[PDB]
């Protein structure tokens, strides 16, 4: 049920107040004009570094996790319409949420409560950046229901959570009573130019990797470019494959003879032997837990 | 609670707790004559009182004494590669003290253990507690215990890794704040941001989640006082 993500998904990447600046940044964002899966029964969905989610007072909280069961750590953000509650307690699998969605509050590890989030449109960005769960949201008057409105809107953060949970699947929750409609967008590592207003509100943005015309707008550090020919970047052909050609020999190098030997000469006249014409498995030496002092110079052991 | 605790997890699965929203007297740790190896990376110990940090992690575990040199940025070995690796960017300070009185035993302890057979030695701050029996069901499984009874004294290790510059400050050492002034150029210190200049009331519309502004070139131009 794909739809176009016109300009949604832009969010303040920090708090460092800036004003009237075309500031460039490189973060995880929703690429411009991407096709989104317009859900409307609720399957499980991959997180993929982060998720855009927009809905049009019906919907309830979300669930994220690796396996969504008491086996592994899980993240549950319920919505109470009275206060937002979060729990990393390892609940059981509830293939159908309903408050019957809560299987068991077992192994409770983290908890948080604050004011609830609560014709319209609510949009939320979820990302798990380095042990920190950032959530961003905004709420807007809209009426075009079949499609995701065209226009611009920034989403200030609500909260980060110091959790560090490996999330790779997730799903929306709804206590039941043809259902409502919501949309899903994925984040990518995309460079963005951002135009901050006179009072520091993000008003517009440029996706530095969508199209050539945007590439020049990006390198010129402006939203408007005058007529001319501008050099944006360089282009090279990515390599098709990797080939390797080593000589034919297979005469595996004698190391035991070096190491297992029962006679080590005195350091006054140190022995020395030359190894040649063979294949030398070096792993035997590196990954052995016997050797007390191991120290390579000019070469790293893991690459020998 | 970090230090006095009677149980330090095995380095296979090192414990970690997050400290927040408090005043941290750091002098207690520095000027104590107990700790063997007091080493601070990226920060000097005598200044920990005058900084403000977002998050402070205290990961604690035990280890064989000769391996205390493994716990340092950019070092390699069995412990530094297969069990607990610090990034090249700093960890705040490493404290370690010889501890064969509590955690050794009359015999081999065998509770504290470490893996020697991870296949893909882990990235910075990864806690891999799996058991997949590295190949020769019968093939040697990763964790092999450590037996205690001066290179094999069990050493307790606690590592304070300061999370600097992520958000508004949250952990600040003891420093009696003073009331603020205006229009006199002062050597100010707002939450760790150390500078000079004259301070004027702002009309600049902040947002309740904005801590300061910088016009360009890291010129901190505005700031909201913490109180």
């Amino acid at each position, epitope marked *: 049920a794909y739809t176009n993500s016109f300009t949604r998904g832009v969010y303040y990447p920090d708090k460092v107040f800036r004003s009237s600046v075309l500031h460039s940044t490189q973060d995880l964002f929703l690429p411009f004009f991407s096709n989104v899966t317009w859900f409307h029964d609720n399957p499980v969905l991959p997180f993929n570094d982060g998720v855009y989610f927009a809905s049009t007072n019906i919907i309830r909280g979300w669930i994220f996790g690796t396996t969504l069961d008491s086996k592994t750590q899980s993240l549950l953000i319920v919505n109470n319409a009275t206060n937002v509650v979060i729990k990393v307690c390892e609940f059981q699998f509830c293939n159908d949420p309903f408050f019957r969605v809560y299987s068991s509050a077992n192994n409770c590890t983290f908890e948080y409560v604050s004011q609830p989030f609560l014709k319209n449109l609510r949009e939320f960005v979820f990302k798990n950046i380095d042990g920190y769960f950032k959530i961003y949201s905004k709420h807007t008057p809209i009426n075009l229901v079949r499609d995701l409105p065209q226009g611009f809107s920034a989403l200030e953060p609500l909260v980060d959570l110091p959790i560090g949970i490996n999330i790779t699947r997730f799903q929306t929750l709804l206590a039941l009573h043809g259902a409502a409609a919501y949309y899903v967008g994925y984040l990518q590592p995309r460079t963005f130019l951002l135009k901050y207003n006179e009072n520091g509100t993000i008003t517009d943005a440029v996706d530095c990797a969508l199209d050539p015309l945007s590439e020049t707008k990006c390198t010129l550090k402006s939203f408007t470019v005058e007529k001319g020919i501008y050099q944006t970047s360089n282009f090279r052909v990515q390599p098709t494959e990797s080939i390797v050609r080593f000589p034919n020999i297979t005469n595996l190098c004698p190391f035991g003879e070096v190491f*297992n030997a*029962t006679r080590f000469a005195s350091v006054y006249a140190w022995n020395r032997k030359r190894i040649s014409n063979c294949v030398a498995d070096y792993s035997v030496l590196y990954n*052995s*837990a*016997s*050797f007390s002092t191991f120290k390579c110079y000019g070469v790293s052991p893991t690459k020998l | 609670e970090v230090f006095n605790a009677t149980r330090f997890a095995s380095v296979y699965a090192w414990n970690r707790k997050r400290i927040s929203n408090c005043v941290a007297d750091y002098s207690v740790l520095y000027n104590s004559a107990s700790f063997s190896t007091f080493k601070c990376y990226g920060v000097s110990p005598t200044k920990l009182n005058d900084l403000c940090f977002t998050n402070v992690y205290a990961d604690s575990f035990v280890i064989r004494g000769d391996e205390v040199r493994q716990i340092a940025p950019g070092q390699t070995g069995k412990i530094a590669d297969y069990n607990y690796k610090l990034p090249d960017d700093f960890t705040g300070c490493v404290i370690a003290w010889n501890s064969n009185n509590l955690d050794s035993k009359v015999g081999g302890n065998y509770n504290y253990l470490y893996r020697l057979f991870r296949k893909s030695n882990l990235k910075p701050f990864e806690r891999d507690i799996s058991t997949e029996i590295y190949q020769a069901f019968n093939c040697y499984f990763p964790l092999q215990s450590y*037996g205690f*009874q001066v290179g094999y004294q069990p050493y307790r290790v606690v590592v304070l890794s300061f999370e600097l510059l992520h958000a508004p400050a949250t952990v600040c050492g003891p420093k009696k704040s003073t009331n603020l002034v205006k229009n006199k150029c002062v050597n100010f210190n707002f939450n760790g941001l150390t500078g000079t200049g004259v301070l004027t009331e702002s009309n600049k519309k902040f947002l309740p989640f904005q801590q300061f502004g910088r016009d360009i070139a890291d010129t901190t131009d505005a700031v909201r006082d913490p109180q």
Partner: antibody, heavy 120, light 111 residues
């Protein structure tokens, strides 16, 4: 297949010297340690002392230092002992054997086979 | 009596899981891996269990071992009457640079 063979049944009187023989066959003799262990009747084995055939380097347990001087002939891969004066309580089953004593990468000790016999 | 200390004997029926243990100092056993042999009356001792918990080829998997601190344990499953023997523990002692044996253990099957 390695084999070590010892001299036949032996009996002697206190006051005399001995030199018992051990022969090794089927393996590179000049690259393995060879040494002696004494098992007494109804009594346990005692570790005696060993030698490196390749260079005539010897290790002696203190409980037998000076007692028995153990030597080799790498010309024919045969090791022997030497005494001073047999004691009456020297009646026991002695044993010659080859044992890995190397340092593969982490040190290891062993015993491959004996199949010997001796008495006094 | 011996620098390692051993039990004098044990006995248990065929089918039982028998664990004998021999003890010594940590100048040797704590750092040097433990070897165990079996000797049948009239048969020269053969290698049974080596450096630790490990058996050669030809020896059935029923045998196992375990070193702890300054002592060692030898265990056997599926005991049978022909397994009656004497059992010995040995290992190169580091300090005296010598290498030593236990005292000996008389395993007699019940039957």
């Amino acid at each position: 297949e390695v084999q070590l063979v010892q001299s036949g049944a032996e009996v002697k009187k206190p006051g005399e010297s001995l030199k018992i023989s051990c022969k090794g066959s089927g393996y590179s003799f000049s690259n393995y340690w060879i040494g002696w262990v004494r098992h007494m009747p109804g009594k346990g084995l005692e570790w005696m002392g060993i030698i490196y055939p390749g260079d005539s380097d010897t290790r002696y347990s203190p409980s037998f230092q000076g007692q028995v001087t153990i030597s080799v002939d790498t010309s024919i891969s045969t090791a022997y002992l030497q005494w001073s004066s047999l004691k009456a309580s020297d009646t026991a089953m002695y044993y010659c054997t080859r044992h890995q004593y190397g340092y593969n990468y982490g040190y290891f000790y062993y015993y491959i086979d004996v199949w010997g016999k001796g008495t006094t | 009596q011996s620098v390692l200390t051993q039990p004098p004997s044990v006995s248990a029926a065929p089918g039982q899981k028998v664990t004998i243990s021999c003890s010594g100092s940590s100048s040797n056993i704590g750092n040097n891996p433990v070897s165990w042999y079996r000797q049948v009356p009239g048969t020269a001792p053969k290698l049974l269990i080596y450096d630790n918990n490990k058996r050669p080829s030809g020896i059935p998997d029923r045998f196992s071992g375990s070193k702890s601190g300054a002592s060692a344990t030898l265990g056997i499953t599926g005991l049978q009457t022909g397994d009656e023997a004497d059992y010995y523990c040995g290992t190169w002692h580091t300090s005296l640079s010598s290498g030593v044996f236990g005292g000996g253990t008389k395993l007699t099957v019940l039957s």
